[PDB]
Amino acid sequence: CRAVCSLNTSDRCDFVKRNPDCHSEGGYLDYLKGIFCYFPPNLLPLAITLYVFWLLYLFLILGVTAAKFFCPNLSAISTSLKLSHNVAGVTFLAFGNGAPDIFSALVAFSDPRTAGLAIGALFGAGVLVTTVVAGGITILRPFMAASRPFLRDITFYMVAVFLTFTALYLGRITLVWALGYLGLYVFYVVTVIICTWVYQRQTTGQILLQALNPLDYRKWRTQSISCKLLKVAKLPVEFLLLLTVPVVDPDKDDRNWKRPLNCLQLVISPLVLVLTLQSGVYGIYEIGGLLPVWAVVVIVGTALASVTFFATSNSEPPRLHWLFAFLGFLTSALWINAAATEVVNILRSLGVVFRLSNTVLGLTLLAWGNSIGDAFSDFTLARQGYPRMAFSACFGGIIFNILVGVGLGCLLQIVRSHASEVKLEPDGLLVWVLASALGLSLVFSLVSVPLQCFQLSKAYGLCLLLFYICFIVVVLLTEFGVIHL
Amino acid sequence: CRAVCSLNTSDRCDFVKRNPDCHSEGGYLDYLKGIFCYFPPNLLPLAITLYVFWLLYLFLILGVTAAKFFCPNLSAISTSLKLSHNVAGVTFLAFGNGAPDIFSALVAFSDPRTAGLAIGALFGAGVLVTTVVAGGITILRPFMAASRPFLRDITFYMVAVFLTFTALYLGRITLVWALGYLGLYVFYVVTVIICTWVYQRQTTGQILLQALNPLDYRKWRTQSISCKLLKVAKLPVEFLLLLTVPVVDPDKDDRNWKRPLNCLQLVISPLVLVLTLQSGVYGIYEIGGLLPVWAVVVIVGTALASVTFFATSNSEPPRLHWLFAFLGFLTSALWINAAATEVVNILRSLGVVFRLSNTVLGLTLLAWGNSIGDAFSDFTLARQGYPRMAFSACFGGIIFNILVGVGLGCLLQIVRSHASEVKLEPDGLLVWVLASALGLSLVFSLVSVPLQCFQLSKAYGLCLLLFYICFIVVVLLTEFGVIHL
Amino acid sequence: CRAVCSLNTSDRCDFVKRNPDCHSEGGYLDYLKGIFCYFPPNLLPLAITLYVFWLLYLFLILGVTAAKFFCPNLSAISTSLKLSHNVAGVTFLAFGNGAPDIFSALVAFSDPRTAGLAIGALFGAGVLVTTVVAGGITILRPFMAASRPFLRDITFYMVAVFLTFTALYLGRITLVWALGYLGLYVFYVVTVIICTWVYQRQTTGQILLQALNPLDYRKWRTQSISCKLLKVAKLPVEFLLLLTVPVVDPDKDDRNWKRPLNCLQLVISPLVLVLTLQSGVYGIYEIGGLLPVWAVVVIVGTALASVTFFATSNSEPPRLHWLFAFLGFLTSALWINAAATEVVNILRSLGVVFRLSNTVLGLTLLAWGNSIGDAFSDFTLARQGYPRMAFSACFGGIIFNILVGVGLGCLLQIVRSHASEVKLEPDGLLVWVLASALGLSLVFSLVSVPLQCFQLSKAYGLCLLLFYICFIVVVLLTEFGVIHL
């Protein structure tokens, strides 16, 4: 595929249409076809810009679904769990800030050609969240960090980073390695729980229309008009997400019980699940050569919706209300998956056009897109007067991200392909530099925080920011071939 | 010329005397001839050291003429123009920058062989003043920086830097590009004015001999004798300036009216103007084969001086006193020009001897020499209790420097040579690194200042200083060929 | 020697017994012999983990000796003589921290092949001390440094470093150079003394058992389990130190006067000195083959002790009590040095275990082990409340090592080998990289500290720490072939 830019403009469409390598196995849109066939060559740059804009919008979706629905379903599950809030919070951070990272890594690992992207998505994020975002917190609100939790988190992160480093050096990932990764993560969770325990011991239709609306005019008037316009674009996407994903909030006395809305959703959610799973391949499968799956799915869904609507009341939620959250969980995750897939495809297309390495795309665009949610949530938490929790999560979430993403992606690739091993092909020297940078950053913290007696100030954040700038300098020099063995 | 160091010592004088390329088109002294003919080879190092000392002294002149006479004439013009003082002060700061940076850039661009020097003079200064000098202010007096002016200045500087970056990548400068540069600068000035308006709305001979002396005995008495000896060397240069350049001070009730001194100056200033313009080429031109220009110039000057002396009184300045400032402007600028030329020539000579690239000389010696005045003025302003003005000027002056210098130099080169374009030949990889460094510095500020809520502290200055040290490390490695594609 | 790893386990011990190039001395135990012959051949790791624990125990010993005996004795010495902090740091702490470095430099200059390794180790130790030790000193306790002594010391250090640079560039050192180094150091000491003088002008049994008891039962009762275990671990070495090293503390009314214990120490400490210095070569030496040195030593010590012994009462401490502190200093310094050597022994075994470039091993392994004592002493002194003295020592001691070690090594090599010169072989570009790093650190300090108004804050140390970490990462990347110079 990469030779496409070296051919005449009159043969680009034929080469793209004829080469199997130039076709993506998953997704709804063929971006390369749009670049090289739908648009004239003279408008080639603008189109790319448009793609970037589209890419950014995707990440916005990956934010909202992660924060308002995945987390709400997780919170309802947590209330059923009655888990300790600190234990729930460690689970929540992976559920909230790191879910897009896991789904992007899984989608990238699903195809060997994008495998180099996946690691580039992870380590680069580890470089960013550790250096910029964490540093930003120390700039916004100086505070005193807890000693023992910080030491535990940094030690576990160092162990995970070294394990992935030696795995990359070995050039392969086996099934037992992924199982060990998952075991290490569950060990970390159990250790956190045990340490915390030890430390502690020592009209109705009009109301439905208002619920349907994602925005309030008085709230919009309060909101800055430019902010409101950005919110309005988000609201249409949010309304579409609401039109399909149920949310269960244990903090509400009514548990967000909307009888006719949820009765419609018992039909809507199975339909979108079937039509979106595996890009809808299961959707058009025709049973016995007569009836498609989607028709019988819709029939069963409307029958169940009618039964539930006639079997329940608008005043008292049904005893099986919690099961809704389970559905509100699954579809939500699936939605994120779909979005993740699109992003990966777009990046691959760019790699074809600009002849860029997969690692550069993984550590620059995908990392920023996946960490924008981390940045927003952490800055909001720090500004509101809780810097300790934000800083603790800034290291807690990255360990969960790396371990769960790598382990789950490798496990699913082993199971699906019936292969005994995932081959990691290191894209030249650059990848090593990336790993090196990450380790260095940790060393700085491992010396900087204890030397200040755990009282974090502004200079620490400024130094971390300058470190990230130097890292991007080194990466930019390495990419353009200025330094080369 | 560069092969001179590869020849036998017995042929160096002949090669220098015979090669047209080894001769400079402008200046009063042939430095290469002095290095290779006047002095014996065994004293080659000492001579170079002497040159460096001489070079430093030139920059001292470039300081004084910029601060005491160019600015004073501008201040009188500003009172006549009745322009707002803050706008006038930015113009005065630009005039001070122009004497030290615009004139050097113009002289460098006047000759293609030194063209690479000019850009090296600009970007390097942008690296220095932004990193060291600005940082120094934050070390001397922590303060709170204004938000909107800082954002406006940094945005305009980023736009100018990116424009010059793409111009360098294109490898050429056209006439329309220089006109666009000048239009952008005038747009920036108009925008500053409009924003400020919107924000605000929302014996007599013995006395003449005393005036002739440049040092106040009382002030000098307090000053250290070694400092006074340095001041005395400056005072002789100041006396030469007082001797030839008139100064009009609107703050003085008498407007610095010295009737016989100025009557002598009406003869002195035209003579030095004619004898110095274009290295005096117009001076020896002989009219009609009988009379040189300088003789008739002196005759007209003494006639006008006698008329003015007999037509005015020592108590009341004449109605046309302001016109004096105009003269006191022009000659002053011309004086700076002469000094600038010398400096450039010296640097070129060194490039011949040490086989050094033009960019290294531009970003190391010329940048420091041109920015010593910025450093002194900004540190003096910060120490006196006005850090906000100094920090604002630290970014305001650089935009004016880059835009006006590049635009005016390119425009004058197009007009003089009747060529349609100025060719920018990038001296290898190093120049790119220089540009990169500048951009990165801005990014740091663009993240560092807002993250601190515009309250600048000591750590910011220390980090900027360390950044400049790292930049000089990279430049030193690049020059000596340690890193090479 | 590394070939013993690939050789059969049965003959490994015999190969070690008859293999050279693995028999470094200066220690007391053959670690490789213990690993490969004693402990069960099939328990390789068992010895390993134990050794790791042993290493940790060593870091405990250096933690105690510096905290309880070295620094209080040195402070008592400084207070008794009314010396300024700068003078004490320049002379006494400098000698105590620089003796092992000088011994290593001599033992390395004994072989002409290892001259480059020795000079590189000296440069690396200088870089580490001037950056990381100073950074920790400034971070742990902010303070205001003396301006004139700091400028003087940094100027002398820069002169010495540039002289070493020139000597390395010439690739040879003659008798004149070594004599000049010695004369320069003597002149530095004389200048220190002269300037300081000019500025100044302008029953017994129960008390013996109680003094030897390191456990305070009242304090013992209230500690936690971990603290109690740590105290139990520290008890034996603390008791041995109490028995060996006298201590004088002017903060107590009795000045820690233990008359019988001090009388016994008057015999114990000199015996330890003679039996330990140069691994007991002087101890085994016989005076005329009839009387060994140790016998005369113990006889004289017992006679002097009985002078003190004749008056049983402790009561009032003698006017010469502060002289004991001098002894309590010297022996204490020895208790540091030996420990540091043992730390290296394990590193040398690690160097034997994993192949490393000899220069690369020398630059980091031979400098961290050499400067671990300096780092411990400086950090302890900074914690106790004397930052000025440690900060001044941070440059005085390094001047001491460079000047005295280089001069003495060159002089001894010239005298012993009867050669007219000592040839320095530059091993690769890593030596020049080390030199450039040292120069950059010195320039950064000289530019930053005066610009900071001599108020050394935490940002200076943090920035230095970042610089050192980045430099170490760059060096490690260069050695492994990632970056080709």
- The beta-carbon neighbor of B485 closest among A463, A466, A484 is A484
**CB of A377 closer than 8 Å to CB of A97:** yes
By DSSP bridging, strand B291-292 and strand B286-287 are antiparallel
**CB of C337 closer than 8 Å to CB of C65:** no
Let me know the angle formed at the C-alpha of A381 by A377 and A384, rounded to the nearest 5 degrees: 140
Residues of B with CB below 8 A from C457's CB?
458-459, 462
Domain made up of A45-202+322-479: CATH architecture: Up-down Bundle (1.20)
Tokens of C187: 């002149």
Locate tokens 């943090």: which residue?
Answer: C462
Instruction: Report which of B149, B97, B94, B99 is spatially closest to residue B125, judged by C-alpha positions.
Output: B97
Q: Is B32 helix (H, G, I), strand (E, B) or coil?
A: helix
Q: Which residues contact B354 (CB under 8 A, 6 or more apart)?
A: none
- Which residues partner with A286 through β-bridges? A292
Element of type H or E holding C325: helix C321-353
DSSP C348-405: HHHHHHS---HHHHHHHHHHHHHHHHHHHHHHHHHHHT-HHHHHHHHHHHHHHIIIII
3-state secondary structure A416-484: HHCCCEEECCCCCCHHHHHHHHHHHHHHHHHHHHHHCCCEECHHHHHHHHHHHHHHHHHHHHHHCCCCC
Residue C287, φ and ψ in degrees, nearest 5: -85, 100
Q: Is C287 helix (H, G, I), strand (E, B) or coil?
A: strand
**CB of C161 closer than 8 Å to CB of C437:** no
Residues C294 and C285: their CA atoms lie apart, in Å, by: 9
Work out the number of other CB atoms within 10 angstroms of the CB of residue A5. 12
**CB of C60 closer than 8 Å to CB of C238:** no
Q: Which residues contact A303 (CB under 8 A, 6 or more apart)?
A: none
Rounded to a whole number of angstroms, the distance between the first and last alpha carbons of chain C is: 31
Q: Which amino acid is at B43?
A: L
Tokens of B69: 């006479």
Q: Specify burial of residue C137 (Cβ count, 10 A radius: 0-12, 13-18, 19+).
A: buried
Element of type H or E holding C143: strand C143-144
- The beta-carbon neighbor of A463 closest among C466, C473, C477 is C466
Question: C436 in contact with B at a CB cutoff of 8 Å?
Answer: yes
Residues C389 and C395: their CA atoms lie apart, in Å, by: 11
Residues of A with CB below 8 A from B452's CB?
139, 458, 462
Q: Which amino acid is at C150?
A: F
Does residue C277 come out as left (phi exceeding 0), alpha (psi in the -120 to 50 range) or beta? beta
Contact B436 A473 (CB under 8 A): yes
- Which residues partner with C143 through β-bridges? C456
**How many angstroms separate the CA of residue A351 from the nearest CA in chain B?**
24
Question: B453 in contact with C at a CB cutoff of 8 Å?
Answer: no
- Which residues partner with C447 through β-bridges? none
**CB of C460 closer than 8 Å to CB of C448:** yes
Does residue A150 come out as left (phi exceeding 0), alpha (psi in the -120 to 50 range) or beta? alpha
Helix C44-65 vs helix C358-384: angle between axes, to the nearest 10 degrees? 40
Sign of the torsion angle spanned by Cα atoms C474, C477, C480, C485 = negative
Element of type H or E holding B286: strand B286-287
Domain made up of B59-202+356-479: CATH architecture: Up-down Bundle (1.20)
**CB of B257 closer than 8 Å to CB of B321:** yes
> From the CA atom positions of chain A, what is the Rg in Å?
24
**How many Cα atoms are found within 13 Å in the side-chain-facing hemisphere of B448?**
30
Domain coordinates of chain B in residue numbers? 59-202+356-479
**CB of C54 closer than 8 Å to CB of C346:** yes
- Which residues partner with B174 through β-bridges? B421
User: Where are the strands (E) in B384-466, listed by range?
Assistant: 421-423, 455-456
Question: B429 in contact with A at a CB cutoff of 8 Å?
Answer: yes
Tokens of A11: 């043969």
Work out the number of other CB atoms within 10 angstroms of the CB of residue B477. 15
**CB of C21 closer than 8 Å to CB of C4:** no
Element of type H or E holding C39: none
Residues in chain C: 485
Q: Please tell me what DSSP assigns to residue C286.
A: E
Residues C171 and C421: their CA atoms lie apart, in Å, by: 10
Q: Which residues contact C233 (CB under 8 A, 6 or more apart)?
A: C57, C60
Q: Which residues contact A285 (CB under 8 A, 6 or more apart)?
A: A292, A293
Tokens of C369: 């082990």
Q: Is B320 helix (H, G, I), strand (E, B) or coil?
A: coil
Tokens of C20: 């050279």
Tokens of A405: 């993403």
Question: B281 in contact with C at a CB cutoff of 8 Å?
Answer: no
DSSP C401-432: IIIIIHHHHHHHHHHHHT-SEEE----SSHHH
User: Where are the strands (E) in B332-425, listed by range?
Assistant: 421-423
Rounded to a whole number of angstroms, the distance between the first and last alpha carbons of chain A is: 27
CA distances from B286 to B100, B282, B342 (A): 34, 9, 27
Does residue C418 come out as left (phi exceeding 0), alpha (psi in the -120 to 50 range) or beta? left
Q: Please tell me what DSSP assigns to residue A132.
A: I
Residues C131 and C127: their CA atoms lie apart, in Å, by: 6
Instruction: Report which of C52, C38, C140 is spatially closest to residue C378, judged by C-alpha positions.
Output: C140
> From the CA atom positions of chain B, what is the Rg in Å?
24
Contact A429 C482 (CB under 8 A): yes
Residues C471 and C452: their CA atoms lie apart, in Å, by: 24
Let me know the angle formed at the C-alpha of A287 by A281 and A290, rounded to the nearest 5 degrees: 120
Q: Could you tell me how many helices (H) and strands (E) chain C has, helices first?
A: 22, 6
- Which residues partner with C140 through β-bridges? none
Residues of C with CB below 8 A from B465's CB?
444, 447-448, 451
Locate tokens 């195809």: which residue?
Answer: A111
Work out the number of other CB atoms within 10 angstroms of the CB of residue A472. 17
DSSP A50-67: HHHHHHHHHHHHHHHIII
Residues in chain B: 485
Instruction: Report which of C266, C334, C322 is spatially closest to residue C297, judged by C-alpha positions.
Output: C266
Element of type H or E holding C291: strand C291-292
- Which residues partner with C78 through β-bridges? none
Residue A313, φ and ψ in degrees, nearest 5: -125, 155
Q: Please tell me what DSSP assigns to residue B101.
A: I
**CB of C161 closer than 8 Å to CB of C483:** no
Sign of the torsion angle spanned by Cα atoms C367, C370, C375, C376 = positive
Residues A375 and A352: their CA atoms lie apart, in Å, by: 30
Q: Which residues contact C34 (CB under 8 A, 6 or more apart)?
A: C47
Residues B123 and B134: their CA atoms lie apart, in Å, by: 16
Residues C34 and B137: their CA atoms lie apart, in Å, by: 61
Work out the number of other CB atoms within 10 angstroms of the CB of residue B473. 16
Question: C473 in contact with A at a CB cutoff of 8 Å?
Answer: yes
Q: Which amino acid is at B56?
A: L
Question: B475 in contact with C at a CB cutoff of 8 Å?
Answer: no
Q: Please tell me what DSSP assigns to residue A146.
A: -
**CB of A35 closer than 8 Å to CB of A24:** no
Tokens of B197: 């308006």
Sign of the torsion angle spanned by Cα atoms C87, C90, C95, C96 = positive
Residues C109 and C412: their CA atoms lie apart, in Å, by: 9
Work out the number of other CB atoms within 10 angstroms of the CB of residue A193. 15
Tokens of B40: 């014996």
Work out the number of other CB atoms within 10 angstroms of the CB of residue C63. 14
**CB of A307 closer than 8 Å to CB of A338:** no
- Which residues partner with C456 through β-bridges? C143
**CB of B334 closer than 8 Å to CB of B273:** yes
Instruction: Report which of C136, B471, B144, C458 is spatially closest to residue A459, judged by C-alpha positions.
Output: C458
Let me know the angle formed at the C-alpha of A181 by A175 and A182, rounded to the nearest 5 degrees: 95
**CB of C429 closer than 8 Å to CB of C118:** no
CA distances from C209 to A431, B178, C258, C271 (A): 64, 91, 10, 22
Mutate to test the interface with B, among C429, C448, C469 (most CBs of B within 10 A): C448
Q: Is B226 helix (H, G, I), strand (E, B) or coil?
A: helix
Contact B451 A140 (CB under 8 A): yes
Residues B472 and A437: their CA atoms lie apart, in Å, by: 22
3-state secondary structure B164-219: HHHHHHHCEEEHHHHHHHHHHHHHHHHHHHHHHHHHHHCCHHHHHHHHHCCCCHHH
**CB of C429 closer than 8 Å to CB of B477:** no
Residues C198 and C184: their CA atoms lie apart, in Å, by: 21
Work out the number of other CB atoms within 10 angstroms of the CB of residue B287. 10
Residues A225 and A433: their CA atoms lie apart, in Å, by: 45
By DSSP bridging, strand C421-423 and strand A286-287 are unpaired
Instruction: Report which of A352, A394, A349 is spatially closest to residue A371, judged by C-alpha positions.
Output: A394
DSSP A380-424: HHHHTT-HHHHHHHHHHHHHHHHHHHHHHHHHHHHHHH--SEEE-
**CB of C110 closer than 8 Å to CB of C422:** no
Instruction: Report which of B206, B215, B216 is spatially closest to residue B239, judged by C-alpha positions.
Output: B215
Q: Which amino acid is at A374?
A: D
Residues of B with CB below 8 A from C452's CB?
139, 458, 462
**CB of B249 closer than 8 Å to CB of B323:** no
Instruction: Report which of A62, A72, A152, A70 is spatially closest to residue A107, judged by C-alpha positions.
Output: A62
Tokens of A151: 């030491």
Residues A184 and A163: their CA atoms lie apart, in Å, by: 11
CA distances from A321 to A77, A204, A262, A266, A328 (A): 12, 20, 10, 12, 11
Q: Which residues contact A145 (CB under 8 A, 6 or more apart)?
A: A388, A391, A392, A449, A454, A455, A456
By DSSP bridging, strand B286-287 and strand A291-292 are unpaired
Q: Which residues contact B454 (CB under 8 A, 6 or more apart)?
A: B144, B145, B146, B147, B150
**CB of A76 closer than 8 Å to CB of A248:** yes
Locate tokens 């879910």: which residue?
Answer: A99
Contact A469 B443 (CB under 8 A): yes
**CB of B63 closer than 8 Å to CB of B47:** no
Q: Is C214 helix (H, G, I), strand (E, B) or coil?
A: coil
Residue C297, φ and ψ in degrees, nearest 5: -60, -50
**CB of C390 closer than 8 Å to CB of C147:** no
Q: Which residues contact B2 (CB under 8 A, 6 or more apart)?
A: B352, B355
Chains near B, with 3+ CB pairs < 8 A?
A, C
User: Where are the strands (E) in A192-316, listed by range?
Assistant: 286-287, 291-292
